[PDB]
């Protein structure tokens, strides 16, 4: 009779963490993704590494 | 409490049926079995509880701590006799069987044996 009450409190905190997590995630990721490419060099910094692919993969 | 542990001889019991307790016997088998086979299966305790680790992961806190202390400090009730005069009601009816009935009966029985001797002879 005790256990079921406990599982609810734990279960709610889990469920709420995900229900924030996706919405927080979408809200963050939709915010900062809007920037970024103004630094084209998020693009270059990889052409850098992508070149360290183009070299260092073969 | 416990369990009565005791012995059942089924052709003995069932046949006995002194009218004022007879009925019980026929029913009494079936009643007993219910308890017998059931209890054999179940466990007597459940799991146990690590309140600390669960508590740390709860967010409505201090409640689990309340319940925890109260549970560990707590004792549940017990269940108790309506009847331990039945225990004794036996020895009285056992007086009935033996002394009262035994003796007068015994005397008759013996005599017939000796009687039979001579009436074989």
UniProtKB/Swiss-Prot annotation, chain A:
Q: Modified residue N6-acetyllysine is at which positions?
A: 30, 42, 53
Note the superkingdom of the native organism.
Answer: Eukaryota
Q: Where in the cell is it found?
A: Mitochondrion; Mitochondrion inner membrane
The family assignment reads: Belongs to the eukaryotic ATPase B chain family.
Q: Quaternary structure per UniProt?
A: Component of the ATP synthase complex composed at least of ATP5F1A/subunit alpha, ATP5F1B/subunit beta, ATP5MC1/subunit c (homooctomer), MT-ATP6/subunit a, MT-ATP8/subunit 8, ATP5ME/subunit e, ATP5MF/subunit f, ATP5MG/subunit g, ATP5MK/subunit k, ATP5MJ/subunit j, ATP5F1C/subunit gamma, ATP5F1D/subunit delta, ATP5F1E/subunit epsilon, ATP5PF/subunit F6, ATP5PB/subunit b, ATP5PD/subunit d, ATP5PO/subunit OSCP.
Q: What does this protein do?
A: Subunit b, of the mitochondrial membrane ATP synthase complex (F(1)F(0) ATP synthase or Complex V) that produces ATP from ADP in the presence of a proton gradient across the membrane which is generated by electron transport complexes of the respiratory chain. ATP synthase complex consist of a soluble F(1) head domain - the catalytic core - and a membrane F(1) domain - the membrane proton channel. These two domains are linked by a central stalk rotating inside the F(1) region and a stationary peripheral stalk.
Write down what this protein is called. Answer: ATP synthase peripheral stalk subunit b, mitochondrial
Organism whose genome encodes this protein = Bos taurus (Bovine)
The gene name on file is ATP5PB
Region of the whole protein represented: 192 to 249 of 256
Swiss-Prot record, chain B:
Judging by the UniProt lineage, the source's domain of life is Eukaryota
Q: Which cellular components does GO assign to this protein?
A: mitochondrial inner membrane; mitochondrion; proton-transporting ATP synthase complex
List keywords of the entry alphabetically. Acetylation, CF(0), Hydrogen ion transport, Ion transport, Membrane, Mitochondrion, Mitochondrion inner membrane, Transport
Q: Which GO terms describe its biological process?
A: proton motive force-driven ATP synthesis; proton motive force-driven mitochondrial ATP synthesis
Where in the sequence is N6-acetyllysine found? Answer: 29, 45, 60, 69, 75, 82, 92, 114
UniProt keyword Lipid biosynthesis, yes or no: no
| GO MF annotation terms | proton-transporting ATP synthase activity, rotational mechanism
The chain residues annotated with the modification N6-succinyllysine are: 75, 82, 92
> Does the record's keyword annotation contain Signal?
no
Subunit structure of this chain's protein:
Component of the ATP synthase complex composed at least of ATP5F1A/subunit alpha, ATP5F1B/subunit beta, ATP5MC1/subunit c (homooctomer), MT-ATP6/subunit a, MT-ATP8/subunit 8, ATP5ME/subunit e, ATP5MF/subunit f, ATP5MG/subunit g, ATP5MK/subunit k, ATP5MJ/subunit j, ATP5F1C/subunit gamma, ATP5F1D/subunit delta, ATP5F1E/subunit epsilon, ATP5PF/subunit F6, ATP5PB/subunit b, ATP5PD/subunit d, ATP5PO/subunit OSCP.
Q: What does this protein do?
A: Subunit d, of the mitochondrial membrane ATP synthase complex (F(1)F(0) ATP synthase or Complex V) that produces ATP from ADP in the presence of a proton gradient across the membrane which is generated by electron transport complexes of the respiratory chain. ATP synthase complex consist of a soluble F(1) head domain - the catalytic core - and a membrane F(1) domain - the membrane proton channel. These two domains are linked by a central stalk rotating inside the F(1) region and a stationary peripheral stalk.
Q: Which family does it belong to?
A: Belongs to the ATPase d subunit family.
List the protein's name: ATP synthase peripheral stalk subunit d, mitochondrial
**Source organism of this protein record:** Bos taurus
Q: Which residues of the full protein are shown?
A: 4 to 124 of 161
